[PDB]
């Protein structure tokens, strides 16, 4: 869930500025590393070694906790605001808000990819195609 809703929002904000859909985000930075229209010095070979080393250790440290509840909701440093750390009823409806935003995210991202397999169009470009004929016809 947490990867999905972090990606569904990223599939739109990246498009809403650049105009490059998330489907075709590959080739357009295979030639030049850009972000918000600003260039970046990394080769794509450099990007993979930076990616595997950095997000490796996060996925190793996430596998270091032994409590099956604390593997889900660790808190601690990851809750600086201390929202769901106390007041267990108030923390509970926070948790129901994350899973509903998790379940809605995964379906929405499985929404993007299937209609990107048929149309070949991205998140918002395949939205405008539906509103293209719906408005005129």
């Amino acid at each position: 869930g947490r990867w999905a809703m972090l990606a569904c929002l990223g599939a739109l904000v990246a498009e809403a500025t650049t105009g490059v859909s998330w489907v075709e985000a590959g080739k357009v930075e295979l030639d030049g590393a850009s972000y918000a229209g600003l260039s970046l010095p990394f080769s794509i070979t450099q990007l993979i070694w930076i990616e595997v080393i950095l997000v490796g250790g996060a996925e190793f440290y996430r596998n270091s906790e032994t409590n099956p509840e604390k593997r889900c909701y660790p808190g601690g440093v990851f809750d600086p605001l201390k929202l769901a750390s106390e007041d267990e009823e108030r923390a509970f409806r926070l948790k129901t808000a994350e899973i509903k935003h998790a379940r809605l995210a995964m379906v929405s991202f499985f929404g993007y990819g299937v209609q990107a397999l048929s149309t070949g169009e991205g998140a918002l470009g395949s939205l405008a195609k539906f509103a293209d004929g719906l408005n005129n016809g």
Partner: protein, 33 residues
């Protein structure tokens, strides 16, 4: 002060059908249940 109008309390747990029962291995301790 309150008044129950415009809605219904339903006295229930809001399952994924309007009237079925809960499977045994699922208990309401988790938030997503």
């Amino acid at each position: 002060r309150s008044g129950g109008v415009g809605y219904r309390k339903y006295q229930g747990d809001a399952l994924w059908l309007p009237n079925t029962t809960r499977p045994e291995w699922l208990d309401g301790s988790l938030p997503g249940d």
